[PDB]
Amino acid sequence: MERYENLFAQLNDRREGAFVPFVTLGDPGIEQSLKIIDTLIDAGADALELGVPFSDPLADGPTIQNANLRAFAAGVTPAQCFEMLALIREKHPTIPIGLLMYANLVFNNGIDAFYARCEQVGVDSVLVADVPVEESAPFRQAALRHNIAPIFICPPNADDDLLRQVASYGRGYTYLLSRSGVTGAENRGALPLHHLIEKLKEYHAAPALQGFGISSPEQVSAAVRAGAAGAISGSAIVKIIEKNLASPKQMLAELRSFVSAMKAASRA
Amino acid sequence: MERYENLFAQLNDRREGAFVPFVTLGDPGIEQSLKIIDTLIDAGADALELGVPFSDPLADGPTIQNANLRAFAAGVTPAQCFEMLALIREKHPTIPIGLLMYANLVFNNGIDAFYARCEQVGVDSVLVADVPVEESAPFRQAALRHNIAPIFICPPNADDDLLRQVASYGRGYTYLLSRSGVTGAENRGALPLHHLIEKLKEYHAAPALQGFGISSPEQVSAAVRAGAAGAISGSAIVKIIEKNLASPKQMLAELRSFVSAMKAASRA
Amino acid sequence: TTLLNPYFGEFGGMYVPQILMPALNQLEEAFVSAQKDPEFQAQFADLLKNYAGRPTALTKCQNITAGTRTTLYLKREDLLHGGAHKTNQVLGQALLAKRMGKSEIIAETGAGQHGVASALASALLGLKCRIYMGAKDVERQSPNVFRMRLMGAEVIPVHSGSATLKDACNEALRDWSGSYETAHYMLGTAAGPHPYPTIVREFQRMIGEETKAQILDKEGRLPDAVIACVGGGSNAIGMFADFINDTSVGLIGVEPGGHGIETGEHGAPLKHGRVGIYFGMKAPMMQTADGQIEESYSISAGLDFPSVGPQHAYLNSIGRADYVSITDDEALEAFKTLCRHEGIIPALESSHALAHALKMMREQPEKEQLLVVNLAGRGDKDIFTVHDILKARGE
Amino acid sequence: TTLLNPYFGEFGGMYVPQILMPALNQLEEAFVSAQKDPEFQAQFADLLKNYAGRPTALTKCQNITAGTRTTLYLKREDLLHGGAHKTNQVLGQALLAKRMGKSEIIAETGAGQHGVASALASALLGLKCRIYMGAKDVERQSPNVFRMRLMGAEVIPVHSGSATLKDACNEALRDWSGSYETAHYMLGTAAGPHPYPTIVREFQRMIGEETKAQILDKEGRLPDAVIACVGGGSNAIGMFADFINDTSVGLIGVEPGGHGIETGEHGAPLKHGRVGIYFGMKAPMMQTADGQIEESYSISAGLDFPSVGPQHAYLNSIGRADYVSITDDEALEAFKTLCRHEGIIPALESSHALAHALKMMREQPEKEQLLVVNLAGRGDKDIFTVHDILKARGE
């Protein structure tokens, strides 16, 4: 949690939004994934969203489905992912690390133990994609007990009650969904979110990051202009991985370029 | 008809039963069939039963089914069969010729015209295998109008009424079925027929010929001893054809031997 | 001597070898006795209801008639156990066999459905079932052959003649000619020698009786026409029988036109064949000029019987029933139509009946008419045939 | 906030992305409203009767129980239009879609039967149906794929994950996550997020209601046990629901034992899996040690859903229902038995249920017991699988 508070405070001072890439851990292998993540950071990522490969990623479009599949083809397991996360935090003191989980991987060996492991390795937040606020109780309790921010989704059509729930229960950042559907750069969000962003601030919600379908610098700037604290980009990053599987050199170069450009767009 | 009367009268004088082979006309070809028939006669046949190949011979076992099929493979048609019958009669003045027909071939171009053609070519009798006495009226009328003996079947279990019908309506000879089932040498009749033979004589029936399953000299002698005027053999003759297809020479030789032996068995 | 008239006008009779006459006479006696026996009727009704699933639905098909003045119902024999109407009469005949003291059943089959119906009835009732099938049919109908074997029946390939249905029919009778004291011949259509056309009618007549009651309940009046596909004639006479005396109700029988009547490649002897004598009856048949029995051709393998039941030829002659034909392509279009617009996959046989109803509607869309089609079977068995046609077609 | 309890004890819930919660809430509202609407109920009853053929027969199977004190009835859902019980609930859900103003249906399918049921309901009612199917299933189930296409549905292969049913299920939800204002997700078993387990139960409960009335009519008392095969749980909860409060009636659910429980190659998560969260519910599932979803293996392709409905897990926990397993070989023997001795070809799924009933009988042949097996489907679709096993076996 507190890594986010410090980041948001600092960005506030730097007059900048946060740019936050997503990748699947272990895609396309453990070693290449670690180098990918280091590159994201070096190129200007303000925080990370990291997916643990799961057999049933039902909020993800094909780009991320395929990322899940590539990690599985390299034999990547949650245990290996947690080793990766320990190493990532061992290298980088302050950057907020958030996991993108599905429920069964959290519940599998006990919800409390899951969040305890997260705390041990230095994770800052967890978003469980198939747990709605209605089911969130044991997840958010476990998270807070272990100093993990539980990340809640605010859909573009959220009603007042849902805004108040997300505002009260959330920590770290509030996930502002661009649109309905599943992750994917091929679908840009087309709903204005400034009313949600204002109401979340009124209710003292954690700062909002816009996510889903963000693939270009103009969208980062738009999110900041609408009042959001920053933006998350997943599919567009993962597409660069997919594109460059045959050339780790070109892969990192293109990741660096893309993240650099996207982070630059976050300057107010 | 009258050829049968004269034959039966003469055999009565010679103290002999009649031996009567069956073959399918045109099996295994027209020319070979004509030579087969001449051989049957020369070897001692007292009369003939001749089948017109038919697509649906439902009173015949496999031996004769296969004879029907061989004639069809040689393209034999009822028209060609009638040409054969004309030639057979042109060669042999007195031998009774009976046809084994199925109903559709008789009815096909008119029942009356069928029997008129029979009269023209010199046929003496017609047995229609799938016409029971109940359906016989237009067949037996047409036959008598054209001087053709209508041949009626007397089953081994015939009741008194059926014996009287067969006795009254029949001419030429009365067909005394050995047994139930269909034609075939593989099944010998096992019912004693002497009671039927006596009742048929009492009712002034045409002389009885026993048929179905007769394949050996002892069976010819048995039929005569039981009071029958003679015996018909089909399958056993046709089997010799089937056996000898590759050797017309051996075929005729074996037909001659078989008919000679069977006719000898008809001596009282 | 018989109890019942073996003829419908000029058509029918008992053209079997003399040896089989006692078998026909026995079966007639037994039938007449059974039809008066309340116990036999209760056993039959019990099997039809609790085993086969009667009564069958009468489904109103709205999508396919939208925008016309046709109201169309389907009598859903496709829902009967076994998936075709044939089940009704095999249960009745199996009971008749039992009544006569027989423990064995002989049946013929072409496309396999009658064999399957005969096998299932035999398995239920503990009868030893043997089924003759043309070798060419056996090779072509592996699924049905296996169904019959699963149900414990013996399937005997027949190699004589044309090695198809008519040849199977012959073999069954040849067997019966020797076995009839212990075995009953469970003939599969409303044809053959008396008493089979009568028996098969009466053991199918519930189709029309139910249709009558159902349409009165739903519509308050009789149908303008009932329409059924005509192979040997069982499903059609089943639908027609109860309406024969309702002279306002049209009885329409649809024979397969195959590649077209004019091509000679068809299965419509009633209207386009010639009367002959075969398989125990005087009836219209497919036959060569010189009287040999011919093929009955249709895209639907089940329309392979080369003749038609004598009561159909009679009802035609007196003008009580009207007979028409539907070509392979018309039947295919009807099959596709019902699948897409009603979610029912019809037998290709039944598709011929549907196609004619659809033609009645389309030709005169402003004509008010209440039609029932007898959907005698389901079409699962046909999906490969149809697939292959549509593919070869570039469709 | 919901109208109804989303949980059965500890099992069930609504584990879907936040974006889908309004879709679930809407569907729950609509269901609750429909269940009180006499017009909706009449439309549903009309479809079940006149289109699908309800009520289904209850058949007493005498041959297979001869010489024992077991009386066995089969509830004949195999006779329903489509040939499996799945038809009952797709008609209900299709009506719910219409109630909510939707003109489009999404469905998942594994072995194909739910896709076919969804397609036929959609064709009847004029809904645009799209059906997700694992690419490995599409390749394996050509017949069902073609049936769905004939009925006008779009069949969309899914290449993600394991390219089988669970992956189809995911895709359907992904689509619904964007399309739910216009499209209804017609989920195919009594599982998934609330309200589906409740809805599918209520739209299948006529199986048990009819069974109850039929057995009272025939036997004058309730059955000692009702027995059904358990994939996700729809046919079983359909049979059980009306007997839950009759505490003397045993409710027995049979999961596939596959090659044997001890081999790990099975489809029996209720008794031999581990509770997890997937496809919107907390339920026993087939899963790896580290929580990845696993295969549900059975000789029967239709038992591929890797979990089980939450009401089943609940009824087990409180001891109201008992769950057992039957292996591939046991199911095969039951399939062969019913074909040969009753002339009914059962689904291999339903064969598992039959096999357990036959074991109850054979183990204790002098025990007086009145059993109903839910014969949820017919087995035509299985005859090739069985043929191949028997051949490879030298049988």
Ligand SMILES: O=P(O)(O)OCCNS(=O)(=O)c1ccc(OC(F)(F)F)cc1
């Ligand atoms: O850029 P895109 O379009 O690929 O979207 C980024 C997705 N990565 S993520 O971890 O933020 C993320 C966040 C929420 C998700 O589902 C949920 F909303 F249902 F919870 C899924 C992924």
Ligand SMILES: O=P(O)(O)OCCNS(=O)(=O)c1ccc(OC(F)(F)F)cc1
């Ligand atoms: O010697 P087999 O066993 O082949 O029998 C000879 C048969 N040839 S036949 O023309 O007499 C003959 C006579 C009657 C037949 O059927 C019928 F009785 F029903 F009318 C069939 C053939």
Ligand SMILES: *Cc1c(COP(=O)(O)O)cnc(C)c1O
């Ligand atoms: C057997 C069959 C036919 C043809 O036989 P009929 O005796 O004329 O009924 C037609 N439709 C179906 C579905 C059949 O099963």
Ligand SMILES: *Cc1c(COP(=O)(O)O)cnc(C)c1O
């Ligand atoms: C679909 C199906 C099953 C398994 O699904 P349930 O939801 O458990 O009923 C079992 N039997 C049959 C015949 C099926 O069609």
Ligand SMILES: [Cl-]
């Ligand atoms: Cl873990």
Ligand SMILES: [Cl-]
């Ligand atoms: Cl809460």
Ligand SMILES: [Cl-]
């Ligand atoms: Cl907060």
Ligand SMILES: [Cl-]
């Ligand atoms: Cl002639």
Ligand SMILES: [Cl-]
């Ligand atoms: Cl007379």
Ligand SMILES: [Cl-]
């Ligand atoms: Cl005389």
Ligand SMILES: [Cl-]
């Ligand atoms: Cl009449």
Ligand SMILES: [Cl-]
């Ligand atoms: Cl007459």
Ligand SMILES: [Cl-]
């Ligand atoms: Cl009565």
Ligand SMILES: [Cl-]
């Ligand atoms: Cl038996």
Ligand SMILES: [Cl-]
């Ligand atoms: Cl078998």
Ligand SMILES: [Cl-]
């Ligand atoms: Cl009315």
